[PDB]
Protein backbone atom coordinates (compact mmCIF):
# COMPACT_ATOMS: atom_id res chain seq x y z
CA UNK A 1 0.00 0.00 0.00
CA UNK A 2 3.02 2.24 0.61
CA UNK A 3 5.64 0.92 -1.83
CA UNK A 4 3.30 0.00 -4.69
CA UNK A 5 1.34 3.28 -4.68
CA UNK A 6 4.58 5.29 -4.55
CA UNK A 7 5.97 3.17 -7.40
CA UNK A 8 2.84 3.86 -9.47
CA UNK A 9 3.11 7.58 -8.67
CA UNK A 10 6.77 7.58 -9.73
CA UNK A 11 5.91 5.67 -12.92
CA UNK A 12 3.21 8.23 -13.69
CA UNK A 13 5.74 11.06 -13.57
CA UNK A 14 8.37 9.26 -15.68
CA UNK A 15 -1.34 7.03 -21.82
CA UNK A 16 0.18 5.21 -18.85
CA UNK A 17 0.37 8.32 -16.63
CA UNK A 18 -3.37 9.04 -16.66
CA UNK A 19 -4.07 5.31 -16.34
CA UNK A 20 -1.82 5.15 -13.27
CA UNK A 21 -3.55 8.22 -11.82
CA UNK A 22 -6.97 6.67 -12.46
CA UNK A 23 -5.79 3.41 -10.87
CA UNK A 24 -4.57 5.33 -7.81
CA UNK A 25 -7.93 7.13 -7.61
CA UNK A 26 -9.81 3.82 -7.93
CA UNK A 27 -7.61 2.36 -5.19
CA UNK A 28 -8.19 5.39 -2.94
CA UNK A 29 -11.96 5.23 -3.53
CA UNK A 30 -12.08 1.74 -2.00
CA UNK A 31 -10.07 2.80 1.07
CA UNK A 32 -1.54 5.35 4.23
CA UNK A 33 -2.77 8.93 4.55
CA UNK A 34 0.67 10.44 5.23
CA UNK A 35 2.45 8.34 2.59
CA UNK A 36 0.30 9.87 -0.16
CA UNK A 37 1.11 13.37 1.13
CA UNK A 38 4.83 12.53 1.27
CA UNK A 39 4.71 11.14 -2.29
CA UNK A 40 2.82 14.24 -3.44
CA UNK A 41 5.42 16.53 -1.86
CA UNK A 42 8.25 14.47 -3.38
CA UNK A 43 6.64 14.59 -6.84
CA UNK A 44 5.84 18.32 -6.55
CA UNK A 45 9.33 19.31 -5.36
CA UNK A 46 10.96 17.43 -8.25
CA UNK A 47 7.81 15.47 -12.58
CA UNK A 48 5.34 18.34 -12.26
CA UNK A 49 2.75 16.81 -14.62
CA UNK A 50 2.58 13.48 -12.78
CA UNK A 51 2.38 15.24 -9.43
CA UNK A 52 -0.37 17.53 -10.72
CA UNK A 53 -2.28 14.50 -12.02
CA UNK A 54 -1.84 12.71 -8.68
CA UNK A 55 -3.07 15.80 -6.82
CA UNK A 56 -6.04 16.32 -9.17
CA UNK A 57 -7.11 12.66 -9.39
CA UNK A 58 -7.62 12.33 -5.62
CA UNK A 59 -10.01 15.32 -5.57
CA UNK A 60 -13.66 14.26 -5.53
CA UNK A 61 -12.78 10.63 -4.73
CA UNK A 62 -11.35 10.57 -1.20
CA UNK A 63 -13.51 13.32 0.28
CA UNK A 64 -11.14 15.83 1.84
CA UNK A 65 -13.27 18.63 3.28
CA UNK A 66 -11.06 21.08 5.20
CA UNK A 67 -7.65 19.50 5.89
CA UNK A 68 -6.82 18.72 2.26
CA UNK A 69 -7.69 22.17 0.89
CA UNK A 70 -5.29 24.01 3.20
CA UNK A 71 -2.50 21.66 2.13
CA UNK A 72 -3.35 21.87 -1.59
CA UNK A 73 -3.65 25.68 -1.61
CA UNK A 74 0.10 26.18 -1.11
CA UNK A 75 0.92 23.62 -3.82
CA UNK A 76 -1.52 25.36 -6.17
CA UNK A 77 -0.12 28.83 -5.40
CA UNK A 78 3.57 27.87 -5.60
CA UNK A 79 3.57 26.82 -9.27
CA UNK A 80 1.04 29.41 -10.50
CA UNK A 81 3.19 32.56 -10.08
CA UNK A 82 6.23 31.40 -12.08
CA UNK A 83 4.93 28.88 -14.59
CA UNK A 84 6.34 26.41 -17.12
CA UNK A 85 4.60 25.16 -20.31
CA UNK A 86 1.22 23.40 -20.75
CA UNK A 87 1.49 21.37 -17.53
CA UNK A 88 0.82 24.77 -15.91
CA UNK A 89 -2.62 24.57 -17.54
CA UNK A 90 -2.99 21.20 -15.81
CA UNK A 91 -2.06 22.90 -12.52
CA UNK A 92 -4.70 25.58 -13.20
CA UNK A 93 -7.23 22.83 -13.97
CA UNK A 94 -6.29 21.12 -10.70
CA UNK A 95 -6.82 24.41 -8.85
CA UNK A 96 -10.20 24.82 -10.54
CA UNK A 97 -11.12 21.25 -9.61
CA UNK A 98 -10.08 21.83 -5.99
CA UNK A 99 -12.16 25.02 -5.98
CA UNK A 100 -15.17 23.08 -7.35
CA UNK A 101 -15.65 20.97 -4.20
CA UNK A 102 -18.28 23.17 -2.55
CA UNK A 103 -16.62 23.83 0.81
CA UNK A 104 -16.74 26.76 3.21
CA UNK A 105 -13.19 27.87 2.35
CA UNK A 106 -14.01 28.15 -1.38
CA UNK A 107 -15.22 31.72 -0.80
CA UNK A 108 -11.81 32.48 0.75
CA UNK A 109 -9.51 30.47 -1.54
CA UNK A 110 -10.96 31.85 -4.78
CA UNK A 111 -11.03 35.55 -3.82
CA UNK A 112 -7.45 35.29 -2.55
CA UNK A 113 -6.50 33.92 -5.98
CA UNK A 114 -8.59 36.38 -8.01
CA UNK A 115 -7.35 39.52 -6.24
CA UNK A 116 -3.78 38.31 -6.71
CA UNK A 117 -4.63 37.69 -10.39
CA UNK A 118 -5.00 41.45 -10.83
CA UNK A 119 -1.47 41.85 -9.42
CA UNK A 120 0.08 40.31 -12.55
CA UNK A 121 -2.35 41.99 -14.96
CA UNK A 122 5.44 36.10 -20.53
CA UNK A 123 4.87 33.28 -18.06
CA UNK A 124 3.10 35.30 -15.35
CA UNK A 125 0.24 37.13 -17.09
CA UNK A 126 -1.00 34.12 -19.06
CA UNK A 127 -0.99 32.01 -15.88
CA UNK A 128 -3.20 34.60 -14.16
CA UNK A 129 -5.48 34.71 -17.22
CA UNK A 130 -5.75 30.91 -17.19
CA UNK A 131 -6.44 30.98 -13.44
CA UNK A 132 -9.20 33.56 -13.99
CA UNK A 133 -10.66 31.44 -16.81
CA UNK A 134 -10.59 28.32 -14.63
CA UNK A 135 -12.20 30.25 -11.75
CA UNK A 136 -14.92 31.53 -14.09
CA UNK A 137 -15.48 28.01 -15.41
CA UNK A 138 -15.55 26.46 -11.92
CA UNK A 139 -17.01 29.08 -9.55
CA UNK A 140 -19.23 31.64 -11.34
CA UNK A 141 -20.49 33.13 -8.06
CA UNK A 142 -17.03 33.75 -6.57
CA UNK A 143 -15.71 35.18 -9.85
CA UNK A 144 -18.46 37.84 -10.02
CA UNK A 145 -17.30 39.54 -6.79
CA UNK A 146 -14.56 41.52 -8.61
CA UNK A 147 -15.78 42.64 -12.04
CA UNK A 148 -14.78 46.34 -12.09
CA UNK A 149 -11.03 45.82 -11.59
CA UNK A 150 -10.69 42.83 -13.93
CA UNK A 151 -11.99 44.73 -16.98
CA UNK A 152 -9.52 47.55 -16.26
CA UNK A 153 -6.61 45.14 -15.74
CA UNK A 154 -7.28 43.02 -18.84
CA UNK A 155 -7.49 46.11 -21.07
CA UNK A 156 -3.86 46.97 -20.25
CA UNK A 157 -2.48 43.44 -19.77
CA UNK A 158 -3.52 42.24 -23.25
CA UNK A 159 -1.85 45.21 -24.99
CA UNK A 160 1.64 43.80 -24.35
CA UNK A 161 3.75 42.47 -27.26
CA UNK A 162 2.88 38.79 -26.94
CA UNK A 163 0.93 36.20 -28.93
CA UNK A 164 0.15 33.53 -26.32
CA UNK A 165 -1.26 36.03 -23.81
CA UNK A 166 -4.03 37.25 -26.14
CA UNK A 167 -5.39 33.72 -26.66
CA UNK A 168 -5.94 33.44 -22.92
CA UNK A 169 -7.15 37.02 -22.53
CA UNK A 170 -9.81 36.54 -25.23
CA UNK A 171 -11.04 33.36 -23.50
CA UNK A 172 -11.11 35.13 -20.13
CA UNK A 173 -13.02 38.07 -21.64
CA UNK A 174 -15.45 35.64 -23.31
CA UNK A 175 -16.06 33.84 -20.00
CA UNK A 176 -16.55 37.20 -18.26
CA UNK A 177 -18.98 38.35 -20.96
CA UNK A 178 -20.85 35.03 -20.68
CA UNK A 179 -21.10 35.44 -16.90
CA UNK A 180 -22.29 39.03 -17.39
CA UNK A 181 -24.87 38.21 -20.08
CA UNK A 182 -26.17 35.11 -18.28
CA UNK A 183 -27.40 37.25 -15.37
CA UNK A 184 -20.07 46.76 -19.27
CA UNK A 185 -20.30 46.08 -23.00
CA UNK A 186 -20.05 49.77 -23.93
CA UNK A 187 -16.76 50.28 -22.07
CA UNK A 188 -15.31 47.17 -23.75
CA UNK A 189 -16.48 48.41 -27.17
CA UNK A 190 -14.94 51.82 -26.44
CA UNK A 191 -11.64 50.20 -25.42
CA UNK A 192 -11.67 48.01 -28.55
CA UNK A 193 -12.35 51.07 -30.72
CA UNK A 194 -9.59 53.06 -28.99
CA UNK A 195 -7.10 50.22 -29.41
CA UNK A 196 -7.60 50.06 -33.18
CA UNK A 197 -6.99 53.76 -33.87
CA UNK A 198 0.90 45.39 -36.60
CA UNK A 199 0.47 44.70 -32.89
CA UNK A 200 -3.06 46.16 -32.55
CA UNK A 201 -4.70 44.09 -35.30
CA UNK A 202 -5.31 40.50 -34.18
CA UNK A 203 -5.97 41.52 -30.57
CA UNK A 204 -8.59 44.04 -31.67
CA UNK A 205 -10.10 41.40 -33.97
CA UNK A 206 -10.28 38.85 -31.13
CA UNK A 207 -11.76 41.53 -28.86
CA UNK A 208 -14.41 42.38 -31.45
CA UNK A 209 -15.21 38.70 -32.12
CA UNK A 210 -16.35 38.23 -28.51
CA UNK A 211 -18.70 41.22 -28.79
CA UNK A 212 -19.95 39.90 -32.14
CA UNK A 213 -20.57 36.43 -30.65
CA UNK A 214 -22.20 37.54 -27.39
CA UNK A 215 -24.87 39.71 -29.06
CA UNK A 216 -25.76 37.18 -31.79
CA UNK A 217 -25.87 33.45 -31.02
CA UNK A 218 -27.14 32.56 -34.51
CA UNK A 219 -23.67 32.73 -36.04
CA UNK A 220 -22.19 30.83 -33.10
CA UNK A 221 -24.71 27.97 -33.25
CA UNK A 222 -23.64 26.98 -36.77
CA UNK A 223 -19.99 26.85 -35.69
CA UNK A 224 -20.96 24.88 -32.57
CA UNK A 225 -22.94 22.40 -34.70
CA UNK A 226 -20.31 22.05 -37.44
CA UNK A 227 -17.55 21.41 -34.88
CA UNK A 228 -19.22 18.20 -33.65
CA UNK A 229 -19.48 16.68 -37.14
CA UNK A 230 -28.41 46.77 -27.85
CA UNK A 231 -24.69 47.53 -27.58
CA UNK A 232 -23.28 45.70 -30.61
CA UNK A 233 -26.44 46.26 -32.69
CA UNK A 234 -26.07 50.06 -32.53
CA UNK A 235 -22.35 50.42 -33.35
CA UNK A 236 -22.40 47.71 -36.02
CA UNK A 237 -21.83 49.75 -39.20
CA UNK A 238 -18.59 51.44 -38.12
CA UNK A 239 -17.18 48.23 -36.63
CA UNK A 240 -17.95 46.28 -39.81
CA UNK A 241 -16.43 49.08 -41.90
CA UNK A 242 -13.25 49.06 -39.80
CA UNK A 243 -13.09 45.25 -40.03
CA UNK A 244 -13.52 45.38 -43.82
CA UNK A 245 -10.83 48.07 -44.07
CA UNK A 246 -8.46 45.98 -41.94
CA UNK A 247 -9.21 42.89 -44.04
CA UNK A 248 -8.68 44.73 -47.34
CA UNK A 249 -5.57 46.64 -46.23
CA UNK A 250 -3.71 43.91 -44.29
CA UNK A 251 -3.86 41.26 -47.01
CA UNK A 252 -0.29 39.90 -46.79
CA UNK A 253 1.20 42.18 -44.12
CA UNK A 254 1.09 40.09 -40.94
CA UNK A 255 -1.06 34.30 -40.57
CA UNK A 256 -2.73 35.19 -37.28
CA UNK A 257 -4.29 38.35 -38.73
CA UNK A 258 -5.68 36.46 -41.73
CA UNK A 259 -7.08 33.75 -39.43
CA UNK A 260 -8.67 36.41 -37.21
CA UNK A 261 -10.17 38.09 -40.29
CA UNK A 262 -11.53 34.77 -41.57
CA UNK A 263 -12.99 34.08 -38.12
CA UNK A 264 -14.56 37.55 -37.80
CA UNK A 265 -15.94 37.68 -41.37
CA UNK A 266 -18.46 34.85 -40.83
CA UNK A 267 -19.98 36.33 -37.66
CA UNK A 268 -20.16 39.76 -39.30
CA UNK A 269 -21.85 38.21 -42.34
CA UNK A 270 -24.32 36.27 -40.17
CA UNK A 271 -25.12 39.31 -38.00
CA UNK A 272 -26.14 41.51 -40.95
CA UNK A 273 -26.40 40.11 -44.52
CA UNK A 274 -23.72 43.34 -51.26
CA UNK A 275 -20.28 44.93 -51.61
CA UNK A 276 -19.01 43.81 -48.19
CA UNK A 277 -20.17 40.23 -48.80
CA UNK A 278 -18.46 40.31 -52.21
CA UNK A 279 -15.23 41.57 -50.63
CA UNK A 280 -15.43 38.86 -47.95
CA UNK A 281 -16.04 36.19 -50.61
CA UNK A 282 -13.10 37.53 -52.63
CA UNK A 283 -10.89 37.47 -49.52
CA UNK A 284 -11.97 33.89 -48.75
CA UNK A 285 -11.35 32.87 -52.38
CA UNK A 286 -7.88 34.43 -52.22
CA UNK A 287 -7.07 32.85 -48.83
CA UNK A 288 -8.33 29.38 -49.81
CA UNK A 289 -5.32 28.83 -52.10
CA UNK A 290 -2.70 30.13 -49.65
CA UNK A 291 -0.90 27.76 -47.28
CA UNK A 292 -1.93 27.40 -43.61
CA UNK A 293 -5.15 29.36 -44.22
CA UNK A 294 -7.56 27.05 -46.09
CA UNK A 295 -8.95 25.25 -43.02
CA UNK A 296 -10.44 28.41 -41.53
CA UNK A 297 -11.37 29.69 -45.01
CA UNK A 298 -13.47 26.61 -45.82
CA UNK A 299 -15.31 26.90 -42.49
CA UNK A 300 -15.85 30.63 -43.07
CA UNK A 301 -17.18 29.93 -46.58
CA UNK A 302 -19.55 27.30 -45.20
CA UNK A 303 -20.71 29.68 -42.47
CA UNK A 304 -21.29 32.45 -45.03
CA UNK A 305 -23.17 30.01 -47.27
CA UNK A 306 -25.36 28.98 -44.33
CA UNK A 307 -25.89 32.64 -43.39
CA UNK A 308 -26.21 34.25 -46.84
CA UNK A 309 -28.24 31.55 -48.58
CA UNK A 310 -29.53 33.64 -51.50
CA UNK A 311 -26.36 35.71 -51.93
CA UNK A 312 -23.84 32.85 -52.11
CA UNK A 313 -25.84 30.92 -54.74
CA UNK A 314 -24.18 32.96 -57.50
CA UNK A 315 -20.77 31.92 -56.09
CA UNK A 316 -21.58 28.19 -56.26
CA UNK A 317 -19.46 27.38 -59.34
CA UNK A 318 -16.33 29.13 -58.03
CA UNK A 319 -15.97 27.04 -54.87
CA UNK A 320 -17.20 23.73 -56.33
CA UNK A 321 -14.38 23.79 -58.88
CA UNK A 322 -11.87 24.33 -56.06
CA UNK A 323 -12.93 21.31 -53.97
CA UNK A 324 -13.03 18.83 -56.87
CA UNK A 325 -9.34 19.50 -57.60
CA UNK A 326 -8.49 18.96 -53.91
CA UNK A 327 -10.14 15.56 -53.29
CA UNK A 328 -8.63 14.14 -56.51
CA UNK A 329 -5.09 14.53 -55.15
CA UNK A 330 -5.80 12.35 -52.11
CA UNK A 331 -6.13 18.51 -44.16
CA UNK A 332 -9.14 16.69 -45.62
CA UNK A 333 -11.15 16.96 -42.38
CA UNK A 334 -12.36 20.56 -42.83
CA UNK A 335 -13.31 20.14 -46.51
CA UNK A 336 -15.99 17.54 -45.71
CA UNK A 337 -17.41 19.75 -42.94
CA UNK A 338 -17.45 22.72 -45.33
CA UNK A 339 -19.22 20.65 -48.00
CA UNK A 340 -21.74 19.53 -45.37
CA UNK A 341 -22.32 23.10 -44.16
CA UNK A 342 -22.64 24.52 -47.69
CA UNK A 343 -25.74 22.41 -48.37
CA UNK A 344 -27.65 23.64 -45.31
CA UNK A 345 -27.64 23.06 -54.12
CA UNK A 346 -28.58 19.38 -54.09
CA UNK A 347 -27.93 18.03 -57.60
CA UNK A 348 -24.35 19.38 -57.58
CA UNK A 349 -23.31 17.06 -54.73
CA UNK A 350 -23.93 13.89 -56.78
CA UNK A 351 -20.91 14.74 -58.93
CA UNK A 352 -19.01 15.73 -55.77
CA UNK A 353 -19.73 12.50 -53.87
CA UNK A 354 -17.64 10.47 -56.35
CA UNK A 355 -14.39 12.03 -55.09
CA UNK A 356 -15.52 12.17 -51.45
CA UNK A 357 -16.01 8.41 -51.55
CA UNK A 358 -12.63 8.14 -53.29
CA UNK A 359 -10.82 10.22 -50.64
CA UNK A 360 -11.01 7.46 -48.03
CA UNK A 361 -12.78 6.28 -44.88
CA UNK A 362 -12.59 8.98 -42.20
CA UNK A 363 -14.77 9.99 -39.25
CA UNK A 364 -15.38 13.59 -40.33
CA UNK A 365 -16.35 12.58 -43.88
CA UNK A 366 -18.68 9.90 -42.48
CA UNK A 367 -20.29 12.45 -40.16
CA UNK A 368 -20.64 14.87 -43.09
CA UNK A 369 -22.28 12.15 -45.20
CA UNK A 370 -24.61 11.27 -42.31
CA UNK A 371 -25.59 14.93 -41.84
CA UNK A 372 -26.14 15.29 -45.60
CA UNK A 373 -28.33 12.18 -45.73
CA UNK A 374 -30.25 13.38 -42.67
CA UNK A 375 -30.79 17.00 -43.74
CA UNK A 376 -31.05 16.61 -47.53
CA UNK A 377 -32.82 13.26 -48.19
CA UNK A 378 -32.98 13.75 -51.97
CA UNK A 379 -30.46 11.09 -53.06
CA UNK A 380 -30.01 8.80 -50.06
CA UNK A 381 -29.74 5.46 -51.87
CA UNK A 382 -27.00 6.79 -54.18
CA UNK A 383 -24.86 7.76 -51.18
CA UNK A 384 -25.68 4.56 -49.28
CA UNK A 385 -24.72 2.35 -52.24
CA UNK A 386 -21.34 4.08 -52.53
CA UNK A 387 -20.81 3.84 -48.77
CA UNK A 388 -21.66 0.12 -48.84
CA UNK A 389 -19.32 -0.40 -51.80
CA UNK A 390 -16.50 1.41 -49.97
CA UNK A 391 -17.15 -0.61 -46.81
CA UNK A 392 -17.18 -3.86 -48.81
CA UNK A 393 -13.91 -2.91 -50.51
CA UNK A 394 -12.43 -2.07 -47.10
CA UNK A 395 -13.58 -5.24 -45.32
CA UNK A 396 -13.00 -7.58 -48.28
CA UNK A 397 -9.20 -7.42 -47.96
CA UNK A 398 -4.99 -1.47 -42.30
CA UNK A 399 -6.48 0.75 -37.81
CA UNK A 400 -9.22 2.53 -39.72
CA UNK A 401 -11.26 -0.66 -40.22
CA UNK A 402 -12.54 -0.43 -36.63
CA UNK A 403 -14.14 2.89 -37.57
CA UNK A 404 -15.40 1.13 -40.71
CA UNK A 405 -17.24 -1.28 -38.41
CA UNK A 406 -18.32 1.79 -36.44
CA UNK A 407 -19.75 3.18 -39.66
CA UNK A 408 -21.26 -0.21 -40.53
CA UNK A 409 -23.47 -0.16 -37.43
CA UNK A 410 -23.99 3.61 -37.28
CA UNK A 411 -27.08 4.14 -39.46
CA UNK A 412 -29.33 1.96 -41.60
CA UNK A 413 -28.36 0.30 -44.89
CA UNK A 414 -29.96 -1.90 -47.53
CA UNK A 415 -27.23 -7.20 -44.84
CA UNK A 416 -26.94 -10.98 -44.52
CA UNK A 417 -23.58 -11.41 -46.26
CA UNK A 418 -22.06 -8.68 -44.08
CA UNK A 419 -22.98 -10.50 -40.86
CA UNK A 420 -21.61 -13.72 -42.36
CA UNK A 421 -18.34 -11.96 -43.20
CA UNK A 422 -18.20 -10.25 -39.78
CA UNK A 423 -18.93 -13.43 -37.79
CA UNK A 424 -15.44 -14.67 -38.72
CA UNK A 425 -13.69 -11.35 -38.05
CA UNK A 426 -13.31 -11.80 -34.29
CA UNK A 427 -12.25 -15.45 -34.69
CA UNK A 428 -9.22 -14.54 -36.83
CA UNK A 429 -8.14 -11.18 -35.40
CA UNK A 430 -5.98 -11.21 -32.26
CA UNK A 431 -6.59 -7.50 -31.63
CA UNK A 432 -8.82 -6.49 -28.73
CA UNK A 433 -10.57 -3.48 -30.27
CA UNK A 434 -11.24 -5.28 -33.57
CA UNK A 435 -13.04 -8.14 -31.80
CA UNK A 436 -14.84 -5.71 -29.47
CA UNK A 437 -16.17 -3.42 -32.21
CA UNK A 438 -16.93 -6.39 -34.48
CA UNK A 439 -19.12 -7.97 -31.79
CA UNK A 440 -20.63 -4.55 -31.04
CA UNK A 441 -21.66 -4.02 -34.67
CA UNK A 442 -22.88 -7.54 -35.47
CA UNK A 443 -24.97 -7.60 -32.31
CA UNK A 444 -26.70 -4.48 -33.65
CA UNK A 445 -26.96 -5.84 -37.21
CA UNK A 446 -29.07 -8.84 -36.08
CA UNK A 447 -32.17 -6.77 -35.28
CA UNK A 448 -34.19 -7.92 -38.39
CA UNK A 449 -35.24 -11.12 -36.62
CA UNK A 450 -41.74 -16.87 -40.67
CA UNK A 451 -39.16 -17.84 -43.29
CA UNK A 452 -36.29 -20.21 -42.49
CA UNK A 453 -33.51 -18.45 -44.40
CA UNK A 454 -32.85 -15.61 -41.95
CA UNK A 455 -33.36 -17.88 -38.93
CA UNK A 456 -30.30 -19.89 -40.02
CA UNK A 457 -27.98 -16.88 -40.18
CA UNK A 458 -29.45 -15.44 -36.95
CA UNK A 459 -28.76 -18.74 -35.16
CA UNK A 460 -25.26 -18.93 -36.70
CA UNK A 461 -24.22 -15.42 -35.62
CA UNK A 462 -25.89 -15.84 -32.20
From Swiss-Prot:
It is found in: Lysosome membrane; Endoplasmic reticulum membrane; Golgi apparatus membrane; Cell membrane. HEAT repeats lie at residues 1-31, 32-64, 65-102, 103-139, 140-180, 182-216, 239-273, 274-309, 310-344, 345-377, 415-449. Expressed in numerous tissues, with highest levels in testis. Autophosphorylates when part of mTORC1 or mTORC2. Phosphorylation in the kinase domain modulates the interactions of MTOR with RPTOR and AKT1S1/PRAS40 and leads to increased intrinsic mTORC1 kinase activity. Residues 1-457 are annotated as: Interaction with NBN. Belongs to the PI3/PI4-kinase family. The kinase domain (PI3K/PI4K) is intrinsically active but has a highly restricted catalytic center. Part of the mechanistic target of rapamycin complex 1 (mTORC1) which contains MTOR, MLST8 and RPTOR. The mTORC1 complex is a 1 Md obligate dimer of two stoichiometric heterotetramers with overall dimensions of 290 A x 210 A x 135 A. It has a rhomboid shape and a central cavity, the dimeric interfaces are formed by interlocking interactions between the two MTOR and the two RPTOR subunits. It is linked to Smith-Kingsmore syndrome: An autosomal dominant syndrome characterized by intellectual disability, macrocephaly, seizures, umbilical hernia, and facial dysmorphic features. Focal cortical dysplasia 2: A form of focal cortical dysplasia, a malformation of cortical development that results in medically refractory epilepsy in the pediatric population and in adults. FCORD2 is a severe form, with onset usually in childhood, characterized by disrupted cortical lamination and specific cytological abnormalities. It is classified in 2 subtypes: type IIA characterized by dysmorphic neurons and lack of balloon cells; type IIB with dysmorphic neurons and balloon cells. Serine/threonine protein kinase which is a central regulator of cellular metabolism, growth and survival in response to hormones, growth factors, nutrients, energy and stress signals. MTOR directly or indirectly regulates the phosphorylation of at least 800 proteins. Functions as part of 2 structurally and functionally distinct signaling complexes mTORC1 and mTORC2 (mTOR complex 1 and 2). This is Serine/threonine-protein kinase mTOR. The gene is MTOR. The chain holds residues 17 to 656 of 2549 of the full protein.
